Each structure stands twice: as structure tokens, then as C-alpha cells.
Amino acid sequence: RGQIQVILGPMFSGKSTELMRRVRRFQIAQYKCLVIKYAKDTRALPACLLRDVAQEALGVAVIGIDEGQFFPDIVEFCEAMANAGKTVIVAALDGTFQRKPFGAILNLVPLAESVVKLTAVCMECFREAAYSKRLGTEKEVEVIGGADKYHSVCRLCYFK
Amino acid sequence: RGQIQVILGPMFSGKSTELMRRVRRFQIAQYKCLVIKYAKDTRALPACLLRDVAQEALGVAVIGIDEGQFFPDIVEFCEAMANAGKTVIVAALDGTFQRKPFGAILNLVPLAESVVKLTAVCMECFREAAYSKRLGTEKEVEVIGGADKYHSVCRLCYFK
Amino acid sequence: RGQIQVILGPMFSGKSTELMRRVRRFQIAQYKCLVIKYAKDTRALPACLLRDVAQEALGVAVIGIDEGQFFPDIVEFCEAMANAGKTVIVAALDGTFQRKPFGAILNLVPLAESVVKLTAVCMECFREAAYSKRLGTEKEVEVIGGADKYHSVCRLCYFKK
Amino acid sequence: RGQIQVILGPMFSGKSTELMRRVRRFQIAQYKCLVIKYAKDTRYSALPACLLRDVAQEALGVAVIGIDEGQFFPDIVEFCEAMANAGKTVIVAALDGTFQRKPFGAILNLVPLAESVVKLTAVCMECFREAAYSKRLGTEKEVEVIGGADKYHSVCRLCYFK
Numbered sequence A, B: 001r002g003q004i005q006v007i008l009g010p011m012f013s014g015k016s017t018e019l020m021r022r023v024r025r026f027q028i029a030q031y032k033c034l035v036i037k038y039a040k041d042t043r044a045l046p047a048c049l050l051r052d053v054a055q056e057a058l059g060v061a062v063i064g065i066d067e068g069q070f071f072p073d074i075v076e077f078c079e080a081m082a083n084a085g086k087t088v089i090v091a092a093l094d095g096t097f098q099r100k101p102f103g104a105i106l107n108l109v110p111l112a113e114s115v116v117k118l119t120a121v122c123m124e125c126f127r128e129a130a131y132s133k134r135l136g137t138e139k140e141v142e143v144i145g146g147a148d149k150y151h152s153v154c155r156l157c158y159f160k
Numbered sequence C: 001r002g003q004i005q006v007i008l009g010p011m012f013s014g015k016s017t018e019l020m021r022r023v024r025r026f027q028i029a030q031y032k033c034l035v036i037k038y039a040k041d042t043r044a045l046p047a048c049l050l051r052d053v054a055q056e057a058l059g060v061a062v063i064g065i066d067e068g069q070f071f072p073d074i075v076e077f078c079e080a081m082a083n084a085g086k087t088v089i090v091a092a093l094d095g096t097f098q099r100k101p102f103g104a105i106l107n108l109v110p111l112a113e114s115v116v117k118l119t120a121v122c123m124e125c126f127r128e129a130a131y132s133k134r135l136g137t138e139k140e141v142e143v144i145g146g147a148d149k150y151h152s153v154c155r156l157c158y159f160k161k
Numbered sequence D: 001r002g003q004i005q006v007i008l009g010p011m012f013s014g015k016s017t018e019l020m021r022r023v024r025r026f027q028i029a030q031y032k033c034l035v036i037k038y039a040k041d042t043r044y045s046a047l048p049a050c051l052l053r054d055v056a057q058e059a060l061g062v063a064v065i066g067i068d069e070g071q072f073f074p075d076i077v078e079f080c081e082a083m084a085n086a087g088k089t090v091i092v093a094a095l096d097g098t099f100q101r102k103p104f105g106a107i108l109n110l111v112p113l114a115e116s117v118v119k120l121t122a123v124c125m126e127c128f129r130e131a132a133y134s135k136r137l138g139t140e141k142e143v144e145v146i147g148g149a150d151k152y153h154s155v156c157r158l159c160y161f162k
């Protein structure tokens, strides 16, 4: 009985921590697990394509994926692994700095049995935050960085 | 402070019941409320475009939208109303009978402060259900109907 | 394979609505369902003791209980029913007007596979509300009434003098 | 503006991890934070304390207070309530139930006091379905016996009564 669980949210909301919490619950009950992280985030098997780790993922019962927005094959990999009987758990940004869908990540939602959106704390007014605000001028989607480059931000502070 | 809350799930998961629970909480505390439903699901204003009813939503503090997937202008309405300081609560199918995004509904996710995906009971094996299965052979996306035309199903029963 | 689910929260948080949402999910999939309500609240079987109703409950697959705080035998009934393979869903206040456990209701928590606490809207400042504030001066726990006798309130409004 | 959040669940449900996830969201937004642990639980797997009163002074100088294994502090209710009323956010990870599936100390008295309450889930160590309970493996009868998976299984209803 395979499965896809999706953990959405803005930056700084602890998506990776929730991912690991959920993975460790299985691990402690004797499940073989594998966590996959996006190689190019220079801030678990590193990968740039989920194809490149599919063989390793096949000999495991539970698959965790961090920063799933950055894998071009995220959708098809997850659906294929769940149909093969695996429990697939994905941590991912739902939105870019422009509050648009981050790549193909939202295509997982109609395929998933569980979907949640976490909240961060707004770094500018300290209320609840749902969005990621880019601090710089760069216009491309993929720009790797932490709190030096992005603020987790509420609606009002986003447009401030 | 305006916001968008999204209630996703398959058919028969009680999305519009959760919509009404959330709205009545504000109503009981003396908030002015408006609920919108899709005018063509026959089976509290009906509408085909949210544009047709937006001026009315302006005179209100809390807006509920049922079957949001059927509204082509769902994204711009919810985003504009939330930025005008309204609480917008949307019940909607995340996926079609083919487990694909239903209209533009998922473009709401990166704009939303709250997103949940509800769960139904699988009408075939009686485990937890995440999807909607069309029973007949019609090909088009919009086919109105209940349990005579659709089953809420788990992954395994979907692929039978 | 039985179960207890507990829906907690203050007044006006829609606990009964969420109870019915969960029950109708099973009903629509052709489960036999029964809902039990507290009889001394006249603001779908009425009852004062769950014992009085246990045989009707034994004949269904899913049992809903509204205002579970008022039932002296809430703990033993839910446990007996869940062990007999029933799905038991309980709507109940967690706290009295004094923010104290309401009867034996919290004893369900260690017995339950699912527990949630819902939120209301504060009727005094309109932020999120977790508590039920009594408007009058009656001192007894059980006083039946709606928004004329109680406000859902946040922490600050609860303590406002 | 003060708050009490409660994270319940059986053992192995990752309550401490969820506690740290919530606290770190505040810390990363430059809030002053304090995490308190039960001193007598020395397991491999944060100020140690046996009474929350003993760390009250440190807690007063902080905006966010995390409390791990809240069930073991006798003064859990009055500490959490006083700190929330003083405008602190207090987040508590705790067992709701003992090995007997009874209330664990005073922990449930927090529930009517709390604006947020959740019960987490574990995996059943005996049938691998969802687990809501903690089953003691040995014969000890006293409530407090410190241990991990060597002494307890997270367990579903059916496996509890086997």
C-alpha cells in the first residue's frame, strides 16, 4: 500500500524537520528508509534528478524527499514509487518568491493522499507567515540562500 | 488583515460542510458573511463567474466559495478580495476524475495562508479515500452528479 | 477494528458540525450510523446516560456523540464500543466556564487514537477563541444556553475586568 | 500576547521533534527562546529541570518557552498558565497517557487552558498500522520508568490488548 504525503509551506517553516519526524517514525519501527536531498542547495543522498537514485529508492520501503520543487521529475518519480508500494514523503516550497507555483510541485496534490501547508513566523512583523520574500534584485527562480537572501513573510509585509 | 483558506479533498469528504463550519464561526460573532456556490451544480448566491457577484462580496467581511474548481476566475477574485482585507474560504476538488489539477484551483495554494486536504471513505474497500473515480465512460471534465456517477476511492481501488 | 476520535473546543467552534461531517463520510459509504445527543439540552437519539442506549449502539458500525461532557459514563461507553469494533466520534467541550476539565471528558484522551481542539472566534475582540466565558453569575457547572449566556473568548478577553 | 500549545501523543510519535520545529520558527525570527528538559530522563536521543519553578527566573527573560516531557513536572499547569498570562508563548511536548492508558500526572489539566492541542501518531511496532498508545514491555508497576524502545512499544488498540 504505497502513498504520497506532501509537506508544503514557505521558507523557514520547518518542512525538512517535519519530513524527518515522519521518516523517523517508520525508521524506529524497523522500516528501511532513504532520504534524498537536492545536490545544488549548498547551504541523505544528494541528487539533481530523482532518476539518478531510483535504483537505491527501489530497495527501501519509505522515501523522503527534501526540496522537491527542484527536481524536474518530482511528479512522475513520486507517483511511480507509490504505485510500486512505497511510502513517499515530500517536503517542498509551494510558491516561488513571486507567489507562483514552484515548478511542477503542485501536480503532486491531486495524486497525494495527504497534503499540508505549514506556517513560518513573519520576519518583519512577527505574525504568522505563508510566503517567501526575496531580499535582492535577481529575477531568476532558482537562487540558493537562507535568511540572508529571503524573509518568511505574511501577506501585508509581502506587499510592503 | 485579509486571508485565503483552501479546503481541498476528493468527492464525499465533506468540504462544503467544513466551509460552512468555518463561516458560521464568524457569522455567530456578528461578522457579515456571503456564501457563493456554482450555479450549474443543481443537486447563498449561485454564480458561474465570481465577477458576477464581486460587488456583493465587497460589502461583506467573510467570503465562502463552494466548488471553487468550476470558477475560471477563482485566483484573481480570491487574491483581490484578500488584499482588500476579506477572509476568503474556498471548498474545492483538487483533482478531476483523472487525478489532474481541476481547472485553476491549485494556483490558489501559493497565494493561500491556509491549505488542507480532506479525506473521504473509499466506497469500494472502505479504507481512506483521496481520489474521485468516474463510474461511467464520459470523457469531458464537467459531469455533474453524486454517488450514482462517482466513487471516492483509495489509490489501489482507483487503479482497478 | 474500533476507534475513538475526540473533537474538543470551546462553545461556538462548530464541534457538532465537524461530528456530523465525519459521521456522514461513513454513512455515504453505506455504514450503519447512530448519533446520540444530550437530552437535557433542547436548544438522533436523546439520552442522559450512554448505558441507556448501548444496545442500539451495538447494532451500528459508527457512533457519534454530541455534548459528551454531560455524560457521566462517557469514558466507559466509548472504550467498550471501540473495543467491540465500533468507530466512536465524540464532540465535547474540553473546559467549563472556569477553564477546568468538563466532567470526565479528558479521560478519553489517553484512550483515543485521534484528538483535536477546534477554535472559535472571540466575540469580544474577534481574534481566535479557545475558551467559553459565562456572562451571568450562576456558580453551578451545568447551565444550558447559547450566545445569550456565553461568549467564546480569547485569553485576554477571558480575563478582562 | 501569551499562548499555550500542547503536543500530545504516544512514545515514538516525534513530539520532541515537533516541539523543536515550532520553537526554531520563532528563534530564526530572532525571538529569545528557552527549552526545558526533564533532568531525570538521561537517555541518548536545553536547561535540565525537575521542577519548572527552578527555571522560572530564566523563563521570565524569554519570549518563547519549550517544555519537553511535560508530564513529569508536578508544577506544569501553574508554570504554563503563569507564563502564558505574562505574555509568553509556551509550547509543551508530553505523553497524554501512561502505560496503563491513564492520564499522565497533571498533563491533561493543560487542555482547557490551551489555545492549541494536538495528538500525534506513531507506527505500531507490532503490526505496523497507526499507534496511539505506549505499551510497557516488562513487569514494573510504578508509573515512572525511564526507557526507550527497549522498554516500550508504540502500539495500536488491538496490539495493546494482546
Ligand SMILES: Cc1cn([C@H]2C[C@H](O)[C@@H](COP(=O)(O)OP(=O)(O)OP(=O)(O)O)O2)c(=O)[nH]c1=O
Pocket (backbone or CB within 6 Å): A010, A011, A012, A013, A014, A015, A016, A017, A041, A043, A066, A067, A068, A091, A092, A093, A095, A096, A097, A098, A132, A133, A141, A142, A143, A144, A145, A146, A150
Ligand atoms: C522562495 C524561493 C526559494 N528558493 C530557494 C532558496 C533556498 O536555497 C531553498 C529553500 O527551500 P526550502 O524547501 O524552504 O528548504 P528546506 O527544506 O530546508 O525548508 P525548511 O527550512 O522549511 O525546512 O529554495 C529559490 O531558489 N527560489 C525561490 O523563489
Ligand SMILES: Cc1cn([C@H]2C[C@H](O)[C@@H](COP(=O)(O)OP(=O)(O)OP(=O)(O)O)O2)c(=O)[nH]c1=O
Pocket (backbone or CB within 6 Å): B010, B011, B012, B013, B014, B015, B016, B017, B041, B066, B067, B068, B091, B092, B093, B095, B096, B097, B098, B132, B133, B141, B142, B143, B144, B145, B146, B150
Ligand atoms: C471528480 C469530478 C467531479 N465533478 C463534479 C461532480 C459533482 O457535481 C461536483 C462535486 O464537487 P464537490 O466540490 O466535491 O461538491 P461539494 O461542494 O458538495 O463537496 P462535498 O460533498 O465534499 O461537500 O463536481 C466533475 O464535474 N468532474 C470531475 O472530474
Ligand SMILES: Cc1cn([C@H]2C[C@H](O)[C@@H](COP(=O)(O)OP(=O)(O)OP(=O)(O)O)O2)c(=O)[nH]c1=O
Pocket (backbone or CB within 6 Å): C010, C011, C012, C013, C014, C015, C016, C017, C041, C043, C066, C067, C068, C091, C092, C093, C095, C096, C097, C098, C132, C133, C141, C142, C143, C144, C145, C146, C150
Ligand atoms: C462552558 C459551559 C457550557 N455549558 C453548556 C451551555 C450549552 O448548553 C452547552 C453547549 O455545549 P457544546 O458542547 O458547545 O454544544 P454543541 O454540540 O452545540 O457545540 P458546537 O456549537 O461547537 O457545535 O454547554 C455549561 O453547561 N457549562 C459550562 O461551563
Ligand SMILES: Cc1cn([C@H]2C[C@H](O)[C@@H](COP(=O)(O)OP(=O)(O)OP(=O)(O)O)O2)c(=O)[nH]c1=O
Pocket (backbone or CB within 6 Å): D009, D010, D011, D012, D013, D014, D015, D016, D017, D041, D069, D094, D095, D097, D098, D099, D100, D134, D135, D143, D144, D145, D146, D147, D148, D152
Ligand atoms: C508510557 C510511559 C513512558 N514513560 C517514560 C519513558 C520515557 O523515558 C518517557 C517518554 O518520553 P517521550 O519523549 O514521550 O518518549 P519518545 O522519545 O519515544 O517520544 P517522541 O518520539 O514523541 O519524542 O517517559 C514512563 O515513565 N511511564 C510510562 O508509563
Ligand SMILES: [Mg+2]
Pocket (backbone or CB within 6 Å): D015, D016
Ligand atoms: Mg521525546
Ligand SMILES: [Zn+2]
Pocket (backbone or CB within 6 Å): A122, A123, A124, A125, A126, A127, A153, A154, A155, A156, A157, A158
Ligand atoms: Zn508580517
Ligand SMILES: [Zn+2]
Pocket (backbone or CB within 6 Å): B122, B123, B124, B125, B126, B127, B153, B154, B155, B156, B157, B158
Ligand atoms: Zn479502496
Ligand SMILES: [Zn+2]
Pocket (backbone or CB within 6 Å): C122, C123, C124, C125, C126, C127, C153, C154, C155, C156, C157, C158
Ligand atoms: Zn478576544
Ligand SMILES: [Zn+2]
Pocket (backbone or CB within 6 Å): D124, D125, D126, D127, D128, D129, D155, D156, D157, D158, D159, D160
Ligand atoms: Zn498494532
